[PDB]
Design a protein around this ligand. Sequence first.
Ligand code: NMN
Ligand code: NMN
Ligand code: MG
Ligand code: MG
Ligand code: MG
Ligand code: MG
Lengths: 464, 464
Amino acid sequence: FNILLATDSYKVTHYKQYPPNTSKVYSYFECREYEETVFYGLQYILNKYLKGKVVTKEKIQEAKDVYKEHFQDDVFNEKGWNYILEKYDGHLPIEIKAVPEGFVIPRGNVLFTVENTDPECYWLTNWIETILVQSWYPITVATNSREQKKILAKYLLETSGNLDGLEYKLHDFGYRGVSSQETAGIGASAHLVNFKGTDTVAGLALIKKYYGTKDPVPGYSVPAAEHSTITAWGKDHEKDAFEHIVTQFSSVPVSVVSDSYDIYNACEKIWGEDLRHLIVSRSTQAPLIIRPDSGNPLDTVLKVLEILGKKFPVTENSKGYKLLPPYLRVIQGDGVDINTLQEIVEGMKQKMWSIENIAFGSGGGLLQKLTRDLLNCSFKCSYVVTNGLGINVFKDPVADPNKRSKKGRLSLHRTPAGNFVTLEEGKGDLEEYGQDLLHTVFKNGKVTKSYSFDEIRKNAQLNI
Amino acid sequence: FNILLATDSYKVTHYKQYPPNTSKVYSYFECREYEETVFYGLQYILNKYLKGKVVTKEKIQEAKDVYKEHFQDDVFNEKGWNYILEKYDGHLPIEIKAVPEGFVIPRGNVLFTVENTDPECYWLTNWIETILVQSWYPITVATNSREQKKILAKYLLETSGNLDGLEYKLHDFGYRGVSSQETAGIGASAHLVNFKGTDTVAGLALIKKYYGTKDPVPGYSVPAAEHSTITAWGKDHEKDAFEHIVTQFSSVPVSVVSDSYDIYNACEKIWGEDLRHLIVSRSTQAPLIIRPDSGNPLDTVLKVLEILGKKFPVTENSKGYKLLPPYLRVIQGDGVDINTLQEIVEGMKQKMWSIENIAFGSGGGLLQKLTRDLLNCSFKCSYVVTNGLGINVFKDPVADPNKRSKKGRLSLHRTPAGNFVTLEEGKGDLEEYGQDLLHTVFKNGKVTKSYSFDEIRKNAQLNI
Ligand SMILES: NC(=O)c1ccc[n+]([C@@H]2O[C@H](COP(=O)(O)O)[C@@H](O)[C@H]2O)c1
Ligand SMILES: NC(=O)c1ccc[n+]([C@@H]2O[C@H](COP(=O)(O)O)[C@@H](O)[C@H]2O)c1
Ligand SMILES: [Mg+2]
Ligand SMILES: [Mg+2]
Ligand SMILES: [Mg+2]
Ligand SMILES: [Mg+2]
């Protein structure tokens, strides 16, 4: 990895475009005006990509050669990069201040700021915009996961009186559905800020290496069938498959995909009659989890629950809602996103089924079907020093007031009523609003403040 | 990287679920029934992740210890992985057959197949489903990019009578807007199958390392301003910024973002009047490229063109369409995806503006706002041998005939009319349709067939 090759190409040409005599460029990141965002993921980027000696004579030469062919022109700032190497031993003269990881902040507030600490490196603040803006992804995954957690909590609470097992109600199925192995790790780690169930193994080592937990691992799974392990038995032998599987995993929870041929037959006749004896004998800590995986997500869930409630003994919990026996549960892992998640729990509630009965798995909806536009993430320059004089800068496009950016040096504060405000134009210095919530997390190639994954989870907790 | 930790958790448990005495699992990938897909990107995965000694004693121990905590149980197949290490020196006993990279194949056809080459490793076929399914991403980027090239080619040909410069009409702006560095390189490389203009530098090294080109680099950029390089001058010095930048890059093309405050004033008064003398003196190989970046993408493009047409000498080309002078172009880089690209070129044509006048930049629309469900990409087991007996397997969910999978051993063939057909149930062996178009690309830890990026580009060419 070479940071000289990890920017948008045009930024290679920007040192020539700033006003002469500019000694400082100061920039900030926000989720421009999903009302609140979980701040998460900068720490990964700082450590993996930005810290320590990131410039070598070899990396300078490699970039020079690449850019000469890429632009068909010599535009690369070899002098500026050589300055960083000889003067700072390849360490970035940059200071980054950020809200603590896991913090839950309203839209349209400063989340982190970036500035150069040596006047020669004015061009470098925005060099690393590209790398840092990629923080949109763990923010957005963490925020969207936590929004699905609110929906789950609300409905579990209304239908059961408590939130037991909430952290296992939405399982990460997204490893195959994301764009790369690196994306898998990051996105899976962001989901684990809110939940504990994952099949995206990649998230585990990222957390262990960049954040840390007191528990041996941040995420857990259970044995579960796929269509290959059912269909391999042959079309007439679905029952044999089911029997073999629940018997292999008789004393842990086991999820068994039941829609290979006919989900409704599988529930009513195979589980419901032929194999019933192997189900009712199961432990409360070791249920069968029936998994549909096709059909209209809501209709399928409701029809599966209706079948199961006629074949197995159903109770009525203290809230008035129906509850399958403890050795029997359902997971809906097809077509699940924040919208369909809401539709299903509401549809369940209308039909008087407790949310205790159901869990969700989500792949693409959880980790891939998300863009930087969803929270309007944006990195902009708000302050420059030119000829020793600070000026407050910003954009304000005539046809889109929504792309207006903030002016000057910025700070984040608690308001008197306990909310948040971003102060502009250096007005945080007047100190009428308490301490800046932004902390220096990076300075001159060193990570200066770190959060464990346990503090992040605490910070991102629901109101509850 | 540890391949033993690069699968969906549940697959760690599958070796215990297949029928006893299973010696072969055979699986295939298709884009289930955008009617044609560009097959691209498997070779990256084969080289980066799958080839060579991928199993060590230390990787087996890492995974053993993680899985023990992750499942709270010993499910992990330590013996199976040890078998591979001892018997094959950690080389995977797997054969992958694939259509050539760059090939354009209709939906619902076999693209690659995976099978184990040692009966002991029957479980390994679907172990690596998760890693291989990630091929959806480069396939989908290359396909969607090529679909945009088709729209661009149509309207450029219609408005100008040729396709000159088509390969530079859609530029990759997506580095910051993807979910990771690895994704940026993969996606940017997929776009470069069709086009040559890119700001996502990560794409280049990926192509060089994994595919190779005749040319020193597979993609190119030009100098370009961003908002910080205009706004740093101060609201009242937008003209000074513009003058400095076009004069710094007076002999190469230069893109200048012009909507910091008022795109229409910038075009009509700053470029059109105050600085017009610095523009009309520019060379054909060094245009000024005006970049709007806000507003309704079509309305903004049409009004910018109308403004410039009144300030600059417009000609009418041989097809009857209006053409700005050759020192002056426009690039629309905000809000661009396949739908808005179509709307702008059609709206342009409607108002009699040649598509010569315009180029596009696209970030999230190009590399991020894409999922595995756009081409319905799916990896499934179709054939198994159990007790020396081969059986044709498949799923066929009752409530979704779209999820029906193919049966048995598969081959891809040319029809008598030169179309494509996927033969099922081993019927390729009858030889009524010529020879299988898949080639073994991986066998027993070695890449056995490879394509250069130049061959890929030729394969992926448009008809026209
Ligand atoms: N443990 C599991 O049951 C498990 C894990 C990973 C993926 N899956 C599969 O992934 C699919 C969901 O993918 P998307 O949400 O990306 O469409 C489900 O259809 C499911 O079959 C299942
Ligand atoms: N050379 C360039 O002008 C250039 C390069 C990379 C990104 N960008 C910016 O990225 C934005 C596009 O982002 P999305 O397409 O992902 O929304 C544009 O608004 C543009 O300002 C521009
Ligand atoms: Mg599935
Ligand atoms: Mg699917
Ligand atoms: Mg922009
Ligand atoms: Mg934008």
